[PDB]
């Protein structure tokens, strides 16, 4: 039904094309925590782009969700 | 000698004057408060010069750049 929303606590400059770049304050959808065997890397979607993100650079936006569509 | 400084944070540049960088990157500090700009430093990272907020960096004691 619902995906977690998370807010960036820090900037993130992608080190590879699989990683999202984002700025502090950006709000993204969490598609999968610890995606594809990674520990600490979350698959997220931000303004239509998808990539992995270090989970420890985010905070969960409590109570706020994005529909799985 | 020019000072070296380490990034404490990643930094997304939004204009070509600014450098983008990742936490842990080490850059050369060419000029602090460059052009009289409070807290903006002229730095070089991997051969690109731009301005960087000093408050994202940590000066590395005893470490200096000298161009080959
Ligand atoms: Mg990184």
From Swiss-Prot, chain B:
Expressed in B-cells (at protein level). Widely expressed with an abundant expression in the testis. Low level of expression seen in the liver, thymus, and peripheral blood leukocytes. Coiled coil: none annotated. It is found in: Cell junction, Focal adhesion; Cytoplasm; Cell projection, Axon. PTK2/FAK1 activation mediates phosphorylation at the YDYVHL motif; phosphorylation is most likely catalyzed by SRC family members. SRC-family kinases are recruited to the phosphorylated sites and can phosphorylate other tyrosine residues. Tyrosine phosphorylation is triggered by integrin-mediated adhesion of cells to the extracellular matrix. Phosphorylated by SRC kinase in a EDN1- and PTK2B-mediated manner; phosphorylation strengthens its interaction with BCAR3 as part of the PTK2B/BCAR1/BCAR3/RAP1 signaling pathway. Residues 1-62 form the SH3 domain. Forms complexes in vivo with PTK2/FAK1, adapter protein CRKL and LYN kinase. Heterodimerizes with NEDD9. Component of a complex comprised of SH2D3C, BCAR1/CAS, and CRK. Within the complex, interacts with SH2D3C (via C-terminus), and CRK. Part of a complex comprised of PTPRA, BCAR1, BCAR3 (via SH2 domain) and SRC; the formation of the complex is dependent on integrin mediated-tyrosine phosphorylation of PTPRA. Interacts with BCAR3 (via Ras-GEF domain); the interaction regulates adhesion-dependent serine phosphorylation. Interacts with SMAD2 and SMAD3. Interacts with NPHP1. Docking protein which plays a central coordinating role for tyrosine kinase-based signaling related to cell adhesion. Implicated in induction of cell migration and cell branching. Involved in the BCAR3-mediated inhibition of TGFB signaling. Contains a central domain (substrate domain) containing multiple potential SH2-binding sites and a C-terminal domain containing a divergent helix-loop-helix (HLH) motif. The SH2-binding sites putatively bind CRK, NCK and ABL1 SH2 domains. The HLH motif is absolutely required for the induction of pseudohyphal growth in yeast and mediates heterodimerization with NEDD9. Belongs to the CAS family. This is Breast cancer anti-estrogen resistance protein 1. The lineage of its organism: Eukaryota, Metazoa, Chordata, Craniata, Vertebrata. The gene is BCAR1. The chain holds residues 4 to 71 of 870 of the full protein.
């Amino acid at each position: 039904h619902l995906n977690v929303l998370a807010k960036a606590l820090y900037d993130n400059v992608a080190e590879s094309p699989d990683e999202l770049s984002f700025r502090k304050g950006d709000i993204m959808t969490v598609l999968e925590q610890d995606t594809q065997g990674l520990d600490g890397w979350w698959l997220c979607s931000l303004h239509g782009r998808q990539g992995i993100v270090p989970g420890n650079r985010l905070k969960i936006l409590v109570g706020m969700y994005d529909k799985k569509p």
